[PDB]
Amino acid sequence: EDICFIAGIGDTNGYGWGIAKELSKRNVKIIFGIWPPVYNIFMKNYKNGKFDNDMIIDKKMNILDMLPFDASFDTANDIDEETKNNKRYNMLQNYTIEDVANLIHQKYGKINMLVHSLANAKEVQKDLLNTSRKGYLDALSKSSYSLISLCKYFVNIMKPQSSIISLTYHASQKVVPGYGGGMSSAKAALESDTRVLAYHLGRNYNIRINTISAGPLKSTFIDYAIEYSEKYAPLRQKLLSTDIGSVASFLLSRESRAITGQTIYVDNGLNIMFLPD
Amino acid sequence: EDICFIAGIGDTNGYGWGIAKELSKRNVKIIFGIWPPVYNIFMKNYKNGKFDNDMIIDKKMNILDMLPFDASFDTANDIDEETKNNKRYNMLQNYTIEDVANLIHQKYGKINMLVHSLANAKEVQKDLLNTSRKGYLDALSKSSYSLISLCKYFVNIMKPQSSIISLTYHASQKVVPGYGGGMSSAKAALESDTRVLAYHLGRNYNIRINTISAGPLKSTFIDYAIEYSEKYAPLRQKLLSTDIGSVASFLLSRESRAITGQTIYVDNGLNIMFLPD
Amino acid sequence: DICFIAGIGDTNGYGWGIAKELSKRNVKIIFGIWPPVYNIFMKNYKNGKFDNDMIKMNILDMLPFDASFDTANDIDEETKNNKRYNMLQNYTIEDVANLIHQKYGKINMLVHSLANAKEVQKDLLNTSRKGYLDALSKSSYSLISLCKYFVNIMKPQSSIISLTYHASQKVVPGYGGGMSSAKAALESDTRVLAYHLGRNYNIRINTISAGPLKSRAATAINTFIDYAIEYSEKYAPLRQKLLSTDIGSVASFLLSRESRAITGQTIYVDNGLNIMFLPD
Amino acid sequence: DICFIAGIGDTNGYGWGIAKELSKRNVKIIFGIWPPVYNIFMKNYKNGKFDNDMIKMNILDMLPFDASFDTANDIDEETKNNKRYNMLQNYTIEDVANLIHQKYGKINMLVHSLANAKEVQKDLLNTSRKGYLDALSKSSYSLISLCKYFVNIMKPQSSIISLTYHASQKVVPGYGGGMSSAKAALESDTRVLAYHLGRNYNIRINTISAGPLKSRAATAINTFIDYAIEYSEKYAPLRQKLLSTDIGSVASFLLSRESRAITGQTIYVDNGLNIMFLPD
Ligand SMILES: NC(=O)c1ccc[n+]([C@@H]2O[C@H](COP(=O)([O-])OP(=O)(O)OC[C@H]3O[C@@H](n4cnc5c(N)ncnc54)[C@H](O)[C@@H]3O)[C@@H](O)[C@H]2O)c1
Ligand SMILES: NC(=O)c1ccc[n+]([C@@H]2O[C@H](COP(=O)([O-])OP(=O)(O)OC[C@H]3O[C@@H](n4cnc5c(N)ncnc54)[C@H](O)[C@@H]3O)[C@@H](O)[C@H]2O)c1
Ligand SMILES: NC(=O)c1ccc[n+]([C@@H]2O[C@H](COP(=O)([O-])OP(=O)(O)OC[C@H]3O[C@@H](n4cnc5c(N)ncnc54)[C@H](O)[C@@H]3O)[C@@H](O)[C@H]2O)c1
Ligand SMILES: NC(=O)c1ccc[n+]([C@@H]2O[C@H](COP(=O)([O-])OP(=O)(O)OC[C@H]3O[C@@H](n4cnc5c(N)ncnc54)[C@H](O)[C@@H]3O)[C@@H](O)[C@H]2O)c1
Ligand SMILES: Oc1cc(Cc2ccccn2)ccc1Oc1ccc(Cl)cc1Cl
Ligand SMILES: Oc1cc(Cc2ccccn2)ccc1Oc1ccc(Cl)cc1Cl
Ligand SMILES: Oc1cc(Cc2ccccn2)ccc1Oc1ccc(Cl)cc1Cl
Ligand SMILES: Oc1cc(Cc2ccccn2)ccc1Oc1ccc(Cl)cc1Cl
């Protein structure tokens, strides 16, 4: 009985979903953490059967639960009155990082797989030089610190030899004009933090953590990235969300017990190239 | 007539000073940017001649000016009332990043060298896993975004083929337990941002930017780092603030016109080692 | 699913651990064995020495294999006539490719699990040209050539792995003879190969940077491995003992279709030691 | 201040640009010249061809030098008797070391500015063992051996540099013959050497990863350099044209005492091209 919490899904079109699908093959029970502002929409679509085709594995994806989850709030203490008043949030509760860990632990006990699959930058459209302090720190808060806080709070509800992964992108290491707003900065911090966290979690809890540097998925510039990737990557096949999924599944399993602190590239090998051929 | 603004000095015991000294050999005019809370102390010591020995180059260090400078505020607009009221700040003015660029430009015209030499993390003593969101973002704000904002505002007051450097540390790339509070995260972001900035500044202004990854200088754990470095680094000599200074001088000169976006290690080669010998 | 494992000489190394793990997924294993140790390995197999170690493997075949030789024409007269090669046939790279293809058809998995350097005991500065080139020939070029001849007997979408060590990237004094150089070249060649193999053949290639394991080869170095192992178990983020099957299950994953979007990569399987700068 | 420059054959490469820049700081330059091009280089010197290019250099000496040979005993009979070596003496590595020491005493600067690969035109997968080993011997081992023999005729706190190319780290199709492999090994060897040289000799060693320059060697590759240059001038963060003196002033800095705390490093002098992932 393995249970994985996936923080950061909004539809079946991203990595979170591809990871849920592949894990389901291993009979892993899935819990979704969903950004409150799209939680109700997601529940509706799910109810209206919009995801039924997406859920087929002759095996059904076993979704144990779907919970509102906001990566920018650590505890009930951090909720500002403007979101308290806020339309969407008003009718939802217990969606802070610590609140969700308590809920899950209470309802289902300890888990052993954790997926951080979320990024947000309010100024992702502006290049770095034109990003505001507010926009930059928002990017870091939502995309980088959220990983640390996730680990801080979920470690108490995880079994020993548990495993954790996040998703990153090569803009951290090499220049991708157009990946702005401090998203590149956020990814660089996330990959560094993955190492620092791997040391602490490894020594203190025997828990592993790694990150997957993924190629482009259509989930503007994304159309460029995907086209360029499919033209110039070593491997011609289309990169599927389940290509990341099967890698994630392996990193979350005990088959990878000796791998931690790593950035693992799942991008058809595009990262290895220097000049177009 | 070359002029360099050095943001982030508080005494003659750090890299900023070593960089000022070496630049002075090249007859570069120096302007110091000093954290307001220690500005007056610094001025006093300077007046009381405490730095006279430190200033000798048979050449005097030519300090063109010394200005209060706070890396956490971008413009006059960002000054919160608590600092406005604040003792130290109350008797100082025009210390925001944009304010200082305007002052310098007004008093002295355009400059062609910029040094970012500052780091601060309010929770540097806590390890990453135990760092608060507030502490983490403060680290990023002061140590990383400050570089971007410095470039944003000083580029308008710099000549073409100007040059910029900052200071970083290898904890960004490899684990150094004890370098906490998100300082490691901040350095990783700074090294990544150095590349992104190098592209923008290079293409749009023909300005270069690089960062120096420095070994330990006594400016607790620092005593460990220095001892370990002196035991295990390829080069036995003591690492001097002027070892960083002479490298900085070269990176800021036109002798390095074809180098940009780089992290340059000035650490007696310690970075190259895996296991102690 | 058939895998050729090039470079196994006993049950104490990574090759055996890889064999073991691939067997679990019902992969057919073919051993390529260096002729100097070929006979003794055979003898121990039939005399059931490895029986405790195979806990049961599916060993399709065991062939003489020397990665120094690309084709039969490359075998020098002395080696040809040597006591231990006497006496043996079809052990070059081209020859084992052909032989394997005749017996079994096309395969889909390849493991390069070998390395050799005559002067490993010398530090780099003191290595001769001859010793250095030997290291690169046996440890690095052998991979390139293995690929060249096996790509024709491999299907799409097959997978190739090799084994490397972090001394290529960071200084490990005592890892001498140009072995550091050979691992650096091999990690670079893995990228270049991943490009050509991916484009032209839809074949994948990656390399595993393993942590210390007390193997035959590891002892060839003048207690270095004992210190290595002991240091890793003390300072690695993960303090479990590193097993050859830890690498093996990672090898199995890389060779399987589950890793179809990974290529050209150096993957560290070393309890995380590589991420550390300063000892604790 | 005396610098030996190993690997100059005309005024169109990095060696010349390095010579030029070192002259500016009043450094005494000794050229080591490959015997195949030794005579013509001499002839052009006295016939004032390079006069426009030396705008005045301080050329202390010009010696025959072949980095394929470690000692006189390494010279094969054919080479020994060849039309172009006929006729020449003391051109091995040990021999030039000794010769330079006798004429001038100890030096404090060394530049490895050479590379060679018989099969550069072939892609890696199609390179023979012989071609690959040639690339590593001439381009990589030559540095190690240069160090071995020159450390005895160098003072503390002397400095050594070599030249490399980013194809070691990222795939550049067309950079064949094992040249990519040779650059990867050389960048690794630079670290290992920096350790031994720093500890035992207080001598520094670094390598410069240069951008494209239309040199003799660069054209040996089957328009590749023209595309390289054109691509760099279009996509590099800095759009100025990359000059051999751009590398030269960086070489001068690395060789001088101003860089006393830098060692084991790969320093990119390439208008920043290396930092880019996606074309504009
Ligand atoms: N798609 C790509 O080409 C690509 C490439 C590399 C990395 N990634 C990474 O993959 C991860 C998943 O993104 P994706 O591409 O699958 O798109 P996605 O929309 O499937 O995933 C991002 C999800 O994060 C959620 N989210 C946003 N703000 C949040 C908050 N404050 N709290 C909680 N959740 C929030 C959103 O609902 C969104 O669904 C991201 O971390 C992204 O950086 C994506
Ligand atoms: N000393 C080392 O061992 C070492 C190693 C690697 C990198 N570095 C880097 O070198 C740089 C200089 O630090 P140092 O070691 O010379 O110590 P330092 O005290 O000389 O430099 C840091 C200075 O930044 C100033 N500062 C702090 N908060 C500020 C703010 N909000 N606005 C403006 N200025 C502020 C302080 O007055 C302080 O003097 C830092 O960026 C540090 O990260 C130091
Ligand atoms: N043991 C470690 O700590 C360690 C760490 C990192 C990487 N590696 C790598 O793992 C691989 C396997 O080494 P190991 O540690 O398992 O030792 P091992 O002795 O078990 O494996 C090496 C095998 O290669 C064979 N071999 C040597 N030269 C050959 C040739 N010319 N032709 C064919 N076969 C030849 C030998 O017979 C030997 O059995 C090597 O590439 C090694 O560099 C080992
Ligand atoms: N040109 C470029 O675009 C470029 C880019 C990056 C790195 N580099 C490197 O710079 C260095 C110099 O190359 P270059 O581009 O200036 O070409 P070049 O032809 O000017 O320099 C190479 C020189 O090395 C000499 N040489 C070759 N084999 C030799 C041997 N066995 N003994 C002694 N001398 C020998 C040749 O006579 C030749 O003059 C090389 O290491 C090269 O890899 C060049
Ligand atoms: O983080 C992401 C990275 C890439 C890679 C990419 C896509 C297109 C062009 C260049 N790079 C694509 C999508 C990504 O998703 C996001 C982007 C911005 C934000 Cl604010 C949030 C997400 Cl989830
Ligand atoms: O940023 C710094 C890095 C090192 C390197 C080091 C020193 C000691 C032990 C380990 N690493 C030493 C001092 C540093 O200065 C700072 C550290 C924390 C802060 Cl909050 C600010 C500064 Cl300027
Ligand atoms: O690549 C290898 C790495 C280690 C780990 C190690 C060895 C020595 C010191 C520290 N760690 C052990 C053996 C390795 O492979 C070899 C190296 C040289 C030779 Cl000659 C043979 C082999 Cl199989
Ligand atoms: O290391 C080198 C790099 C470049 C730049 C380049 C060459 C080809 C394609 C793209 N860029 C040109 C020449 C280089 O050196 C050599 C490579 C092979 C040989 Cl045989 C000789 C030399 Cl000097």
Short mmCIF file of C-alpha atoms in Angstrom, two decimals, chain C:
data_model
loop_
_atom_site.label_atom_id
_atom_site.label_comp_id
_atom_site.label_asym_id
_atom_site.label_seq_id
_atom_site.Cartn_x
_atom_site.Cartn_y
_atom_site.Cartn_z
CA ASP C 1 14.77 -8.93 -24.21
CA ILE C 2 18.42 -9.92 -24.54
CA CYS C 3 21.33 -8.11 -22.92
CA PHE C 4 25.03 -8.52 -23.69
CA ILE C 5 27.15 -7.76 -20.64
CA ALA C 6 30.71 -6.87 -21.63
CA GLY C 7 33.04 -7.10 -18.65
CA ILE C 8 32.30 -9.62 -15.93
CA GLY C 9 34.95 -11.77 -14.25
CA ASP C 10 33.33 -12.86 -11.00
CA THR C 11 30.36 -12.12 -8.74
CA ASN C 12 31.97 -9.25 -6.80
CA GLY C 13 31.62 -6.45 -9.36
CA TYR C 14 28.94 -4.29 -10.95
CA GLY C 15 28.52 -6.57 -13.96
CA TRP C 16 27.16 -9.35 -11.77
CA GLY C 17 24.87 -7.00 -9.87
CA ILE C 18 23.53 -5.77 -13.20
CA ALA C 19 23.02 -9.34 -14.45
CA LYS C 20 21.14 -10.22 -11.27
CA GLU C 21 18.74 -7.26 -11.56
CA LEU C 22 18.05 -7.78 -15.26
CA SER C 23 17.18 -11.43 -14.54
CA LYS C 24 14.45 -10.19 -12.20
CA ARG C 25 12.73 -8.54 -15.17
CA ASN C 26 13.15 -11.78 -17.17
CA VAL C 27 15.94 -10.43 -19.38
CA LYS C 28 18.14 -12.93 -21.24
CA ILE C 29 21.79 -12.39 -20.24
CA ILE C 30 24.88 -13.08 -22.34
CA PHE C 31 28.24 -12.72 -20.56
CA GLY C 32 31.31 -11.43 -22.39
CA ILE C 33 34.34 -12.54 -20.41
CA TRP C 34 37.97 -11.41 -20.62
CA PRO C 35 40.06 -14.43 -21.70
CA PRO C 36 42.59 -14.10 -18.87
CA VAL C 37 39.76 -14.97 -16.42
CA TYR C 38 37.51 -16.92 -18.81
CA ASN C 39 38.42 -20.49 -17.79
CA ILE C 40 38.30 -19.96 -14.02
CA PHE C 41 34.94 -18.20 -14.32
CA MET C 42 33.57 -21.15 -16.29
CA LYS C 43 35.01 -23.67 -13.83
CA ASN C 44 33.40 -21.89 -10.89
CA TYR C 45 30.07 -21.77 -12.70
CA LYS C 46 29.79 -25.52 -13.30
CA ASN C 47 31.35 -26.28 -9.91
CA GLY C 48 28.42 -24.35 -8.46
CA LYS C 49 30.47 -21.67 -6.70
CA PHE C 50 28.19 -18.90 -7.96
CA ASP C 51 25.04 -20.84 -7.00
CA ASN C 52 24.71 -18.91 -3.74
CA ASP C 53 25.21 -15.69 -5.70
CA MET C 54 22.51 -16.38 -8.31
CA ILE C 55 19.68 -16.35 -5.78
CA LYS C 56 17.77 -18.11 -10.26
CA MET C 57 19.62 -16.22 -13.01
CA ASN C 58 18.95 -16.88 -16.72
CA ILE C 59 22.41 -17.08 -18.28
CA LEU C 60 21.86 -17.55 -22.01
CA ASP C 61 25.56 -17.86 -22.79
CA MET C 62 29.17 -17.13 -21.76
CA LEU C 63 31.64 -16.02 -24.43
CA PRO C 64 35.33 -15.06 -24.54
CA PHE C 65 35.57 -11.33 -25.12
CA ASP C 66 38.46 -8.89 -25.33
CA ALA C 67 37.54 -5.25 -25.92
CA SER C 68 41.14 -4.42 -26.94
CA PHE C 69 40.45 -5.95 -30.33
CA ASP C 70 38.03 -4.51 -32.86
CA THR C 71 38.40 -7.30 -35.44
CA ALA C 72 40.34 -10.55 -35.86
CA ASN C 73 42.86 -8.61 -37.92
CA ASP C 74 43.64 -6.55 -34.80
CA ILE C 75 44.83 -9.54 -32.77
CA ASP C 76 48.62 -9.42 -32.52
CA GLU C 77 50.52 -12.66 -33.07
CA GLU C 78 51.70 -12.93 -29.46
CA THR C 79 48.20 -12.60 -27.99
CA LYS C 80 46.88 -14.93 -30.68
CA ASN C 81 49.40 -17.51 -29.49
CA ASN C 82 49.20 -16.76 -25.76
CA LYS C 83 48.50 -19.63 -23.35
CA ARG C 84 45.14 -18.17 -22.34
CA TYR C 85 43.84 -17.05 -25.76
CA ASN C 86 45.27 -20.14 -27.36
CA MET C 87 42.66 -22.01 -27.77
CA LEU C 88 39.77 -19.50 -27.95
CA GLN C 89 37.99 -17.95 -30.94
CA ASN C 90 35.69 -15.12 -32.01
CA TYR C 91 36.52 -12.91 -29.04
CA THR C 92 37.09 -9.61 -30.83
CA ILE C 93 34.36 -6.98 -30.90
CA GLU C 94 33.23 -7.59 -34.49
CA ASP C 95 33.36 -11.36 -33.85
CA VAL C 96 31.18 -11.44 -30.73
CA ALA C 97 28.67 -9.18 -32.46
CA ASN C 98 28.42 -11.61 -35.39
CA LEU C 99 28.41 -14.70 -33.17
CA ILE C 100 25.65 -13.30 -30.93
CA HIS C 101 23.59 -12.33 -33.96
CA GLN C 102 23.89 -15.79 -35.51
CA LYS C 103 22.98 -17.68 -32.34
CA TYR C 104 20.20 -15.37 -31.12
CA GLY C 105 19.33 -12.71 -33.70
CA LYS C 106 19.16 -9.04 -32.73
CA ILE C 107 19.40 -7.88 -29.13
CA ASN C 108 18.07 -4.75 -27.44
CA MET C 109 20.36 -4.19 -24.48
CA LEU C 110 24.10 -3.59 -24.11
CA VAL C 111 26.22 -3.07 -20.99
CA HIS C 112 29.80 -1.78 -21.07
CA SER C 113 31.10 -2.78 -17.65
CA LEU C 114 34.85 -2.80 -18.01
CA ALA C 115 37.94 -0.67 -17.57
CA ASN C 116 41.65 -1.25 -17.51
CA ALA C 117 44.83 0.75 -17.16
CA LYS C 118 48.31 -0.71 -16.85
CA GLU C 119 49.58 2.22 -14.77
CA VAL C 120 46.58 2.90 -12.54
CA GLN C 121 48.97 2.84 -9.57
CA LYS C 122 50.89 5.84 -10.88
CA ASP C 123 49.57 9.36 -10.52
CA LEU C 124 48.67 11.22 -13.73
CA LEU C 125 51.84 13.33 -13.89
CA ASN C 126 53.92 10.16 -13.75
CA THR C 127 51.94 8.12 -16.29
CA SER C 128 53.72 7.26 -19.55
CA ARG C 129 52.18 7.97 -22.96
CA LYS C 130 51.86 4.24 -23.46
CA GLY C 131 50.09 3.68 -20.13
CA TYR C 132 47.73 6.63 -20.70
CA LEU C 133 46.77 5.49 -24.21
CA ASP C 134 46.20 1.97 -22.87
CA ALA C 135 43.75 3.39 -20.32
CA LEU C 136 41.85 5.28 -22.98
CA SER C 137 41.90 2.39 -25.45
CA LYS C 138 40.55 -0.23 -23.05
CA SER C 139 38.25 1.97 -20.94
CA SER C 140 36.95 4.54 -23.42
CA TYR C 141 37.44 3.68 -27.09
CA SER C 142 36.15 0.17 -26.34
CA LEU C 143 32.71 1.72 -25.72
CA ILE C 144 32.71 3.57 -29.04
CA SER C 145 33.69 0.43 -30.92
CA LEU C 146 31.26 -1.72 -28.96
CA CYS C 147 28.56 0.65 -30.18
CA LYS C 148 29.82 0.66 -33.78
CA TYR C 149 29.52 -3.13 -34.15
CA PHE C 150 26.50 -3.78 -31.96
CA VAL C 151 24.24 -1.10 -33.47
CA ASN C 152 23.79 -3.40 -36.46
CA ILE C 153 22.59 -6.30 -34.32
CA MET C 154 20.35 -4.13 -32.16
CA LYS C 155 16.77 -3.13 -32.80
CA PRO C 156 15.26 0.22 -32.25
CA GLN C 157 14.50 1.26 -29.61
CA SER C 158 17.42 -0.38 -27.83
CA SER C 159 19.47 0.95 -24.94
CA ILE C 160 23.14 1.06 -23.99
CA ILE C 161 24.82 1.81 -20.67
CA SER C 162 28.36 2.08 -19.36
CA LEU C 163 29.92 2.67 -15.95
CA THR C 164 31.95 5.67 -14.88
CA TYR C 165 33.37 7.32 -11.76
CA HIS C 166 33.27 10.89 -10.38
CA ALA C 167 37.10 11.23 -10.60
CA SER C 168 36.45 12.47 -14.16
CA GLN C 169 34.76 15.59 -12.75
CA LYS C 170 36.52 16.12 -9.39
CA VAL C 171 39.99 15.21 -8.19
CA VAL C 172 40.42 11.83 -6.53
CA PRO C 173 44.15 11.36 -5.86
CA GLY C 174 45.10 7.71 -6.30
CA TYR C 175 42.74 7.17 -9.24
CA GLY C 176 45.73 7.16 -11.56
CA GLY C 177 47.05 5.84 -14.85
CA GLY C 178 44.79 8.08 -16.90
CA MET C 179 41.71 6.36 -15.50
CA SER C 180 40.36 9.78 -14.54
CA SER C 181 41.04 10.89 -18.11
CA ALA C 182 39.39 7.78 -19.50
CA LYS C 183 36.21 8.38 -17.45
CA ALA C 184 36.08 12.02 -18.57
CA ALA C 185 36.38 10.98 -22.22
CA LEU C 186 33.78 8.27 -21.75
CA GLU C 187 31.28 10.71 -20.20
CA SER C 188 31.86 13.09 -23.12
CA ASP C 189 31.66 10.27 -25.69
CA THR C 190 28.36 9.20 -24.12
CA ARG C 191 26.83 12.55 -25.21
CA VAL C 192 28.32 12.49 -28.73
CA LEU C 193 27.25 8.86 -29.17
CA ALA C 194 23.77 9.66 -27.82
CA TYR C 195 23.41 12.18 -30.63
CA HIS C 196 24.44 9.90 -33.52
CA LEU C 197 22.74 6.81 -32.09
CA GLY C 198 19.53 8.66 -31.32
CA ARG C 199 19.28 10.39 -34.70
CA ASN C 200 20.29 7.54 -36.97
CA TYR C 201 19.17 4.53 -34.99
CA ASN C 202 16.72 5.66 -32.35
CA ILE C 203 19.07 3.94 -29.88
CA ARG C 204 19.75 5.33 -26.41
CA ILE C 205 23.01 5.52 -24.48
CA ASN C 206 23.68 6.70 -20.93
CA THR C 207 26.36 6.10 -18.29
CA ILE C 208 26.13 5.33 -14.57
CA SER C 209 28.55 7.08 -12.23
CA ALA C 210 28.77 4.53 -9.43
CA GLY C 211 30.06 4.87 -5.88
CA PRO C 212 32.78 2.65 -4.40
CA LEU C 213 32.42 -1.14 -4.43
CA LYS C 214 35.12 -3.63 -3.38
CA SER C 215 35.60 -5.43 -6.69
CA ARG C 216 38.57 -7.15 -8.34
CA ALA C 217 39.43 -3.98 -10.25
CA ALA C 218 39.04 -1.76 -7.17
CA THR C 219 41.73 -3.70 -5.30
CA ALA C 220 44.12 -3.41 -8.26
CA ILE C 221 44.66 0.16 -7.02
CA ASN C 222 47.49 0.12 -4.45
CA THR C 223 43.14 0.08 0.81
CA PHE C 224 42.24 2.93 -1.52
CA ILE C 225 38.89 1.23 -2.10
CA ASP C 226 38.51 0.46 1.63
CA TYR C 227 39.02 4.13 2.43
CA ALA C 228 36.72 5.11 -0.44
CA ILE C 229 33.98 2.81 0.83
CA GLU C 230 34.44 3.85 4.43
CA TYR C 231 34.46 7.56 3.57
CA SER C 232 31.31 7.20 1.47
CA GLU C 233 29.43 5.27 4.18
CA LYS C 234 30.37 8.01 6.64
CA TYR C 235 29.76 11.15 4.55
CA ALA C 236 27.23 10.29 1.82
CA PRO C 237 23.74 11.77 2.33
CA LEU C 238 22.47 8.17 2.41
CA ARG C 239 24.34 6.04 4.89
CA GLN C 240 23.16 2.61 3.76
CA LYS C 241 25.88 0.36 2.29
CA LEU C 242 26.10 0.67 -1.49
CA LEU C 243 25.37 -2.66 -3.19
CA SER C 244 26.14 -3.81 -6.73
CA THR C 245 22.40 -4.46 -7.11
CA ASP C 246 21.73 -0.78 -6.31
CA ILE C 247 23.54 0.05 -9.55
CA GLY C 248 21.91 -3.01 -11.15
CA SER C 249 18.33 -1.87 -10.65
CA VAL C 250 19.31 1.56 -12.02
CA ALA C 251 20.95 -0.15 -15.01
CA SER C 252 17.78 -2.18 -15.51
CA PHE C 253 15.68 0.98 -15.54
CA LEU C 254 17.99 2.76 -18.01
CA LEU C 255 17.99 -0.25 -20.32
CA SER C 256 14.19 -0.58 -20.22
CA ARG C 257 11.55 1.40 -22.12
CA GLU C 258 10.62 3.23 -18.92
CA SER C 259 13.60 5.54 -19.57
CA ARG C 260 12.77 6.13 -23.25
CA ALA C 261 13.22 9.93 -22.93
CA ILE C 262 16.65 9.81 -21.23
CA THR C 263 19.84 9.83 -23.28
CA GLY C 264 23.40 11.13 -23.27
CA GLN C 265 23.30 11.35 -19.47
CA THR C 266 25.68 10.67 -16.58
CA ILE C 267 23.44 9.29 -13.80
CA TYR C 268 24.93 9.13 -10.29
CA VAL C 269 24.19 6.04 -8.23
CA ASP C 270 26.38 6.70 -5.23
CA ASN C 271 24.17 7.38 -2.21
CA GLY C 272 24.46 11.07 -3.14
CA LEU C 273 28.14 11.50 -2.23
CA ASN C 274 28.75 13.53 -5.40
CA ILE C 275 26.61 16.43 -4.13
CA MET C 276 28.87 17.14 -1.13
CA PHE C 277 31.51 19.88 -0.96
CA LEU C 278 32.70 19.94 2.64
CA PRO C 279 32.91 16.82 4.85
CA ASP C 280 29.93 17.01 7.22
#
